[PDB]
Tab-separated table of C-alpha atoms and ligand atoms in Angstrom:
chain	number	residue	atom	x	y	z
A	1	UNK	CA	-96.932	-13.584	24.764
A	2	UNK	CA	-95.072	-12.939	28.021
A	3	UNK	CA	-92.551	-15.881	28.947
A	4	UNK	CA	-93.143	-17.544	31.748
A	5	UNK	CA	-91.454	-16.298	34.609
A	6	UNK	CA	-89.863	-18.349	37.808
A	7	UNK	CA	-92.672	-16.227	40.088
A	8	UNK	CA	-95.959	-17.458	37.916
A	9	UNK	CA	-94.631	-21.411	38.218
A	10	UNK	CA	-96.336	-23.544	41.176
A	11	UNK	CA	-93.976	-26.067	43.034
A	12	UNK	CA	-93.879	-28.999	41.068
A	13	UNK	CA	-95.424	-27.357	37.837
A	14	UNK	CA	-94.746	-26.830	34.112
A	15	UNK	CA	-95.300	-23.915	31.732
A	16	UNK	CA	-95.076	-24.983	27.766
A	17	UNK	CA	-94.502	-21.840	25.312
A	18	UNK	CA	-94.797	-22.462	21.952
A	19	UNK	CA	-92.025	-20.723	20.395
A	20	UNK	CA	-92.694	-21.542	16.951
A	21	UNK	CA	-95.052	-23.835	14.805
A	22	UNK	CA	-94.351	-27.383	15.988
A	23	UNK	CA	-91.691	-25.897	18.651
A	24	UNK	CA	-92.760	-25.555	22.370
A	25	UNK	CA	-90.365	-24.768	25.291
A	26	UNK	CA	-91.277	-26.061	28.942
A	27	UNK	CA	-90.253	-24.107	31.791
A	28	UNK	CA	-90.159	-25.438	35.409
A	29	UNK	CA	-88.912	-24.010	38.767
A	30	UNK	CA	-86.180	-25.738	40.962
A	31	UNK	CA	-85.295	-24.182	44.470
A	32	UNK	CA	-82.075	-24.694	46.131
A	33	UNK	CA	-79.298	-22.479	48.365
A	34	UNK	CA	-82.640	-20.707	49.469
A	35	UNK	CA	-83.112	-19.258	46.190
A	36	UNK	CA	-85.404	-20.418	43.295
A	37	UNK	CA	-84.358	-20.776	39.448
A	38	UNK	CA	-86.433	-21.151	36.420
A	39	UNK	CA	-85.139	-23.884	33.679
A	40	UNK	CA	-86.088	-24.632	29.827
A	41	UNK	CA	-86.200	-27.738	27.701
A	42	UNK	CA	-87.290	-28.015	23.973
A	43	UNK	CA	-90.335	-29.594	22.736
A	44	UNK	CA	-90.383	-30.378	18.817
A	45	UNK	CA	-93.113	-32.111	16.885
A	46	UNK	CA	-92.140	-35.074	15.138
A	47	UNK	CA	-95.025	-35.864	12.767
A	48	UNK	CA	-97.629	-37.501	15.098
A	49	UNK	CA	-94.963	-38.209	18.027
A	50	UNK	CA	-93.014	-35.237	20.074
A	51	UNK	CA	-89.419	-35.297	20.582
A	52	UNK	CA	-88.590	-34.034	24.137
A	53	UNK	CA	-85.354	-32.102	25.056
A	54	UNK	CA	-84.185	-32.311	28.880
A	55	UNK	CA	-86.085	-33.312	31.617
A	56	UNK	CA	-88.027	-30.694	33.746
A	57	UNK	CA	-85.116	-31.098	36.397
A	58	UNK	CA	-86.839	-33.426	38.703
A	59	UNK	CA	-88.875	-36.694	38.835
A	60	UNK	CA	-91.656	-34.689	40.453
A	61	UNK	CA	-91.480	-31.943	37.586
A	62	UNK	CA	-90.884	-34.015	35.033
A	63	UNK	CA	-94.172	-36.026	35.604
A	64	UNK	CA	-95.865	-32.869	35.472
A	65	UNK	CA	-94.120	-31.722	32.519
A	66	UNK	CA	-95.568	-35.360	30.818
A	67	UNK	CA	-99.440	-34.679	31.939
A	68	UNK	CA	-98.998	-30.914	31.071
A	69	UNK	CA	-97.819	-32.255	27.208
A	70	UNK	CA	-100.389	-34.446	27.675
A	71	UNK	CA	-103.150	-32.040	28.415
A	72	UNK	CA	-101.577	-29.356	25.623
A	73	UNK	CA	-100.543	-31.141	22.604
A	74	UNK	CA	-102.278	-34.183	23.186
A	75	UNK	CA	-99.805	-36.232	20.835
A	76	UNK	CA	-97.169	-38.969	22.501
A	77	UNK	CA	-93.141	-37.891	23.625
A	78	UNK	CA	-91.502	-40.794	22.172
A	79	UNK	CA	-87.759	-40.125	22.239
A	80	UNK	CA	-85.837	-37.756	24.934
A	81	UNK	CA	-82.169	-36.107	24.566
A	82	UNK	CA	-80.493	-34.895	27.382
A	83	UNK	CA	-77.752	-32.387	26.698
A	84	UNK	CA	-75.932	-32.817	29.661
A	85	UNK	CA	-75.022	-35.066	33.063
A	86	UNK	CA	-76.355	-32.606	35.370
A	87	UNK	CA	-79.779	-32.987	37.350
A	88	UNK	CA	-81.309	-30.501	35.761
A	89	UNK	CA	-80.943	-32.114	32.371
A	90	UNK	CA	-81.042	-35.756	33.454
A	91	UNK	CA	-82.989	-35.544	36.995
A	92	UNK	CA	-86.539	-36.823	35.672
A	93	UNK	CA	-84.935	-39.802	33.083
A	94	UNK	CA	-85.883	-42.788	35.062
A	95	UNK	CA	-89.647	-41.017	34.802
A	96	UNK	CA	-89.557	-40.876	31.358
A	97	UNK	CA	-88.055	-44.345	30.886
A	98	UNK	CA	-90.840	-45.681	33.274
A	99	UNK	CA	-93.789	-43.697	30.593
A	100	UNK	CA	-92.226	-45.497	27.640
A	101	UNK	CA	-89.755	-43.172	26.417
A	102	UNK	CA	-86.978	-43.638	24.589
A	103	UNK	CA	-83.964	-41.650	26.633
A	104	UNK	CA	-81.098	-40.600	24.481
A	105	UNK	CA	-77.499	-38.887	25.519
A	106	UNK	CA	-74.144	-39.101	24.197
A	107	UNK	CA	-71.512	-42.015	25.977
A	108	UNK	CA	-69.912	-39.013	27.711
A	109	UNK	CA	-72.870	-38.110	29.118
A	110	UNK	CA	-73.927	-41.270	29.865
A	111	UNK	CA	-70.491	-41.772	31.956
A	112	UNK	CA	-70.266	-38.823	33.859
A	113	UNK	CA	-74.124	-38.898	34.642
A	114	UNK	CA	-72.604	-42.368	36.213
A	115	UNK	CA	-70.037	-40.733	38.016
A	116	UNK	CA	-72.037	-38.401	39.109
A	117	UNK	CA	-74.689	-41.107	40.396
A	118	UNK	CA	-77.590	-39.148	38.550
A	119	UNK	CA	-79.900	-40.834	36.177
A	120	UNK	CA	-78.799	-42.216	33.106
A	121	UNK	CA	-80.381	-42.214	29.813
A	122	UNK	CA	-80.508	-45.186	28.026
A	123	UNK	CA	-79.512	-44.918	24.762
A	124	UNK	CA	-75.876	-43.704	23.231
A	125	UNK	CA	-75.969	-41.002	20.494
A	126	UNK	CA	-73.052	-41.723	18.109
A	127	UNK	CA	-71.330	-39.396	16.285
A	128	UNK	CA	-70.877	-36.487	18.572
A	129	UNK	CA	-67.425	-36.808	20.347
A	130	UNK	CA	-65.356	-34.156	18.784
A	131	UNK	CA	-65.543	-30.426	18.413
A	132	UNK	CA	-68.207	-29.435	15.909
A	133	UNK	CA	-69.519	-32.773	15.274
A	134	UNK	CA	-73.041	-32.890	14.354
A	135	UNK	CA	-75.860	-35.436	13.776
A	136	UNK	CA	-80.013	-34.959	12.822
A	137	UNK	CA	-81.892	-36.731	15.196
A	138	UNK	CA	-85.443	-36.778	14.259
A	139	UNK	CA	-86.700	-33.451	13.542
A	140	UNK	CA	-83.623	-31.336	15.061
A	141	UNK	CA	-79.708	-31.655	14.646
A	142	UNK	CA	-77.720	-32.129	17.830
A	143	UNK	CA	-74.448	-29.935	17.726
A	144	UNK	CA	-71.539	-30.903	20.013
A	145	UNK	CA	-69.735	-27.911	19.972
A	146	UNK	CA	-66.979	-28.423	22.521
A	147	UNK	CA	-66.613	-28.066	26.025
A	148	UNK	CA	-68.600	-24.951	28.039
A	149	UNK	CA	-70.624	-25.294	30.481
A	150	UNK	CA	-69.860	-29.375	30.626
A	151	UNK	CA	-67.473	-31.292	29.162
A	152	UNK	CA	-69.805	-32.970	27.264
A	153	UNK	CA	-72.776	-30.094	26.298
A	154	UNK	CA	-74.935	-30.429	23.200
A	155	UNK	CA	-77.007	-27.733	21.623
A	156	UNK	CA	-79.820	-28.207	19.322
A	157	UNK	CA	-80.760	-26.730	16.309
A	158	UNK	CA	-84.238	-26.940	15.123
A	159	UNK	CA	-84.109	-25.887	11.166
A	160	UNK	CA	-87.943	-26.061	10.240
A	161	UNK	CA	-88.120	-23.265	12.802
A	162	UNK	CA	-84.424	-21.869	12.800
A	163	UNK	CA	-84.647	-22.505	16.987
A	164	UNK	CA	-81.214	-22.643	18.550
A	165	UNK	CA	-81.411	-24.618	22.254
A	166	UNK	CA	-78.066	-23.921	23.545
A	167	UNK	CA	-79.091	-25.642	26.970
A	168	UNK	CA	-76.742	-24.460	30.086
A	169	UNK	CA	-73.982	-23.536	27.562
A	170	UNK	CA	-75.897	-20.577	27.125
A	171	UNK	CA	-77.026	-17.501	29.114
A	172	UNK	CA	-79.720	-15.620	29.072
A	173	UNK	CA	-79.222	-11.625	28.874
A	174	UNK	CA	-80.671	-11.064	32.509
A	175	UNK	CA	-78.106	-13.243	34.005
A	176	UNK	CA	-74.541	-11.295	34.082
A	177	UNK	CA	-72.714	-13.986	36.424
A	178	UNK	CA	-71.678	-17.795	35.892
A	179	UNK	CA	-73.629	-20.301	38.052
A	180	UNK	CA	-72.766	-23.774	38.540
A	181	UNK	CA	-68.956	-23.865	36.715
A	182	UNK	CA	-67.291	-26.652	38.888
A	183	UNK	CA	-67.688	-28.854	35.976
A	184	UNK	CA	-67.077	-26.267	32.977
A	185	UNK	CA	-64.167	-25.571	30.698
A	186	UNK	CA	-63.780	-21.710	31.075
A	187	UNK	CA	-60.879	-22.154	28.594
A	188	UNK	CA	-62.874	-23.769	25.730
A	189	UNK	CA	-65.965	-22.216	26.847
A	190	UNK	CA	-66.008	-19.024	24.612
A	191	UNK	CA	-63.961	-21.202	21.593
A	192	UNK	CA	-67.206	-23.314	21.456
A	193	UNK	CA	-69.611	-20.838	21.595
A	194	UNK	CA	-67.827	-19.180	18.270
A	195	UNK	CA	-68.341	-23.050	17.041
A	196	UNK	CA	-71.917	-22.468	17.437
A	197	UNK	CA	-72.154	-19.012	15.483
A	198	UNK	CA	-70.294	-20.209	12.918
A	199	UNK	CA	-73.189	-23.452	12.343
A	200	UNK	CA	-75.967	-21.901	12.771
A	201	UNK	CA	-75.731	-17.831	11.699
A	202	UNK	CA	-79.484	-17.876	10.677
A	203	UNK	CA	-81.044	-19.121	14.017
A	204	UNK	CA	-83.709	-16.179	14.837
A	205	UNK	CA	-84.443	-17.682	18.795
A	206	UNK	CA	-81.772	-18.753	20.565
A	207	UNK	CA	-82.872	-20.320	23.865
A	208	UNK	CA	-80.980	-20.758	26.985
A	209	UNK	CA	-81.079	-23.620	29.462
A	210	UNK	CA	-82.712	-20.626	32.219
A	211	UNK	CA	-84.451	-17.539	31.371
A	212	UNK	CA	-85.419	-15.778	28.949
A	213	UNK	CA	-85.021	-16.234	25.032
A	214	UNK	CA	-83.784	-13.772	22.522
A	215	UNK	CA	-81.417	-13.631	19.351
A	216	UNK	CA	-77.662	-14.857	19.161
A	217	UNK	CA	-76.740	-11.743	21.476
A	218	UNK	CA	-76.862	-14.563	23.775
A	219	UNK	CA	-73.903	-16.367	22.689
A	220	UNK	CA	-71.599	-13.189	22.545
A	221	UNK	CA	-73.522	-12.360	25.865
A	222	UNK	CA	-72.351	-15.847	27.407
A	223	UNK	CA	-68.805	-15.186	26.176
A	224	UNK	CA	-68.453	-12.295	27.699
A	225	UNK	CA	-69.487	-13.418	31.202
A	226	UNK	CA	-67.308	-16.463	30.683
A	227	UNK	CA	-64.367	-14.142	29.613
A	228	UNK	CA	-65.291	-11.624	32.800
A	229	UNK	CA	-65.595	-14.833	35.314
A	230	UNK	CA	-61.706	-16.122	33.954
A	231	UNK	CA	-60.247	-12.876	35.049
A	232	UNK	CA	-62.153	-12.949	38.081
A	233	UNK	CA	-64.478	-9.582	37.812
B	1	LIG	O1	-75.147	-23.622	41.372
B	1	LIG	C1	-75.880	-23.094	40.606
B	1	LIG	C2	-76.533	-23.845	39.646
B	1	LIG	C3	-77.404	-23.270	38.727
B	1	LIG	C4	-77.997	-24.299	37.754
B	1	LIG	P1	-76.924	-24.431	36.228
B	1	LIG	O2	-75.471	-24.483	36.631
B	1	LIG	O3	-77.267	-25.680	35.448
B	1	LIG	O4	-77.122	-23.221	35.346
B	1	LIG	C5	-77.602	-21.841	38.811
B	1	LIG	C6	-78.422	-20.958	38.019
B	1	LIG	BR1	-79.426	-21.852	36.617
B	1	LIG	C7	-78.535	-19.592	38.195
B	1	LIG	C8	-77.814	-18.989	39.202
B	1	LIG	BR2	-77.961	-17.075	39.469
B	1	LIG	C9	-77.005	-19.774	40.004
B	1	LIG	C10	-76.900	-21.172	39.812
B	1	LIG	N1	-76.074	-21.798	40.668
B	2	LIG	ZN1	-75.014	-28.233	34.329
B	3	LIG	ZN1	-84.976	-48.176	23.581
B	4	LIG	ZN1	-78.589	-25.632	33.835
B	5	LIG	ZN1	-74.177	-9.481	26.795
């Protein structure tokens, strides 16, 4: 049905929209600079357990995003990945540690979230430190596909579903202008989006770390606002 927008989200609240069979995405509202923004995650069944993907951005939302899986699905998040350092991938860890959850992120992530004096999840994913590395974790493959948005950015791939979560790497159609780019590669950033059409051609919804979800328009749609921002227009 209709997405949920950034206007039908309550402070503090979570939307889940189950974007295929066994794959939800939860949507929560973050307001900053006098403006408010609407942000995804991934939620993928596991068997009888849930793997999560992202916080909620936020202790606050991210215990409501835990009672709202709670309430929905009813089955137990047991493991978490978060795809990148910033606070709205990380910001919401230390909940989930403190509900039992396994937290998951690759040792770059780990050390800039550090850096950064964010929360850090706990456990180091191996095997994703150069350009088009990629591991299965669980029920989903995590993709590092080069330097974008971060430094250290994953996507994932669901394949029982063909869903493509290209987290903040990826823009949705709506949004024509780069956001938060202090920490991006603008050189690499269109390189490893082509790394990521050239894995996963048959993904039929790709979706984007805010907004909206459609096809893989979106990742020729992010290049070109990438390519539009380097030349300054
Ligand atoms: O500084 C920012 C940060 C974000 C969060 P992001 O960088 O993780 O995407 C942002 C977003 Br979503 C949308 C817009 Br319009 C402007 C933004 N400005
Ligand atoms: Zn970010
Ligand atoms: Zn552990
Ligand atoms: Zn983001
Ligand atoms: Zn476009």
């Amino acid at each position: 049905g209709e997405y949920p927008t950034v206007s039908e989200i309550p402070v503090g609240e979570v939307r889940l929209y189950q974007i295929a069979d066994g794959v939800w995405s939860h949507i929560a509202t973050q307001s900053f600079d006098g403006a408010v923004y609407p942000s995804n995650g991934l939620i993928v069944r596991d068997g009888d357990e849930l793997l999560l993907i992202d916080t909620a951005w936020g202790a606050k939302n991210t215990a409501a995003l835990l009672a709202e899986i709670e309430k929905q699905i009813g089955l137990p998040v047991t493991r978490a990945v978060s795809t990148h350092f910033h606070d709205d991938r990380v910001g919401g860890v230390d909940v989930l540690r403190a509900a039992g959850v396994a937290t998951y992120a690759s040792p770059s992530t780990r050390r800039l979230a550090e850096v950064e004096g964010n929360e850090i999840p706990t456990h180091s994913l191996e095997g994703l430190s150069s350009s088009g590395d990629a591991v299965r974790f669980g029920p989903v493959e995590l993709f590092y596909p080069g330097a974008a948005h971060s430094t250290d950015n994953l996507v994932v791939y669901v394949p029982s579903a063909s869903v493509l979560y290209g987290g903040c790497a990826i823009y949705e159609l709506s949004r024509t202008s780069a956001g938060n780019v202090a920490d991006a590669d603008l050189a690499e950033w269109p390189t490893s989006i082509e790394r990521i059409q050239q894995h996963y051609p048959e993904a039929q919804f790709v979706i984007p770390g805010h907004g909206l979800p459609g096809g893989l328009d979106l990742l020729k749609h992010t290049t070109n606002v990438v390519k539009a921002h380097t030349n300054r227009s």
